[PDB]
Ligand binder design. Structure first.
Ligand code: ZN
Ligand code: ZN
Lengths: 253, 244
């Protein structure tokens, strides 16, 4: 129903909402009427047996409004839980040149299948982190990109930097671990009997904790030394391979 | 929940050159009583706090990329947060908030969980200000901060703020000589027996070795950390235990 199309691509997986705690006797019509305010519905999936469903709306904006408006609202004695659906066809990409843009990444990955979005993750100064996200329309397109970039060498720019493609890690930093669930542990009462505190010089917990911190600091130093050791190995490889291939030199063979 | 917090604060860019404060407030009148408003006329952007997170989310979704006297507005949540790790599975969002509240007002505290709702042992604590966040960071770095009876020192680090929404648009890329050199060759799968393939395949082997070595460091130090409890229980003595 939107007069101006929000963009080139609509009803993407970033426009998909998860709705939990539906009533036992939900119907598709009732489910669609819940979202009627937010334009023409796209794909609808309802698990009537398990009390949840999915809907795609036309735009990310409409999904954000629906979530904000419908989350924690009553339906026949149940508070609806509305969340953005976790993306089923998303990949992490890393080892990106700093001169790879969102559009280059999308253009590149579009060869694997229809692509919804690609983004280069930037730091607080707008500089590339060398990492990105690619969101495909279909799981098979994501699987082909994952398999082909794993087996082969996919290059986006002049500098030979193979794109490293991994499953996108999707952890929950919205709901987290509420005290309602934590309390179900037997030893919870015993763990909370001592309040948050600074440990004091001379106590067992202070001495244990300072030694633990010293091992953690040693682990940090060793992990940094490994990165430095492997950077030197990668720079030595580059120099040896340039020489093997006579990169700065004409040679018939 | 608290009202008009830092998580209710919106950035609005691409304001008209002759924007007025009242014109700016009328933009957000739909969303009830405005909180603190500030306009940087210098650069054509403004900030407004709305009553709740839900209202700020709706305003951002309804006003972003809408026209205002010539240009399309850019509406973002305005961006004081700390990473926390070595959390025990007993730590809830509410315990994290209660514990870190002594350093200053908390915007959000959450324990990061997996899709089965199990603690990852990591969390995020967002304060209303960078000073309160620096204080909490300095105190927990220097000192031993404990949340529960079983001693596990909370390991606190500034959370680096990353952008996965706007990212790096082609229009904002600097077209300097490194851009020109990099863009000269297009996206491709390299061919066996070329320098770019053979080097890249050896690079991947080294990158895999680096991951395995990092994992071995983590496993060697996990063994050391686990042994420490028993070693400490055996070796601990009070300061007055052996005095002449
Ligand atoms: Zn002492
Ligand atoms: Zn080969």
């Amino acid at each position: 129903s939107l007069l101006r199309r929000p963009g080139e691509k609509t009803y993407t997986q970033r426009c998909r909402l998860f709705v939990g705690n539906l009533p036992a006797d939900i119907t598709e019509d009732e489910f669609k009427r819940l979202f009627a305010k937010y334009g023409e519905p796209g794909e609808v999936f309802i698990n009537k047996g398990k009390g949840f469903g999915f809907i795609k709306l036309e735009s990310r904006a409409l999904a954000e409004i629906a979530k904000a408006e419908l989350d924690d609202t009553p339906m026949r004695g149940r508070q609806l839980r509305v969340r953005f659906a976790t993306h089923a066809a998303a990949l992490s990409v890393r080892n990106l040149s700093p001169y790879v843009s969102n559009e280059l990444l999308e253009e590149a990955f579009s060869q694997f299948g229809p692509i919804e979005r690609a983004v280069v993750i930037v730091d607080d100064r707008g500089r590339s982190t060398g990492k990105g996200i690619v969101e495909f329309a279909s799981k098979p397109a994501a699987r082909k990109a994952f398999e082909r970039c794993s087996e082969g060498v996919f290059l986006l720019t002049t500098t030979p930097r193979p794109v490293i493609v991994e499953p996108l890690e999707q952890l929950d930093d919205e709901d987290g671990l509420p005290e309602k669930l934590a309390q179900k542990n037997p030893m919870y009462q015993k763990e909370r009997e001592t309040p948050p505190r600074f440990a004091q010089h001379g106590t067992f917990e202070y001495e244990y904790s300072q030694r633990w911190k010293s091992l953690d600091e040693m682990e940090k130093q060793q992990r940094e030394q490994v990165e430095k050791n492997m950077k030197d190995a990668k720079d030595k490889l580059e120099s040896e391979m340039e020489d093997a291939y006579h990169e700065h030199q004409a040679n018939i063979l």
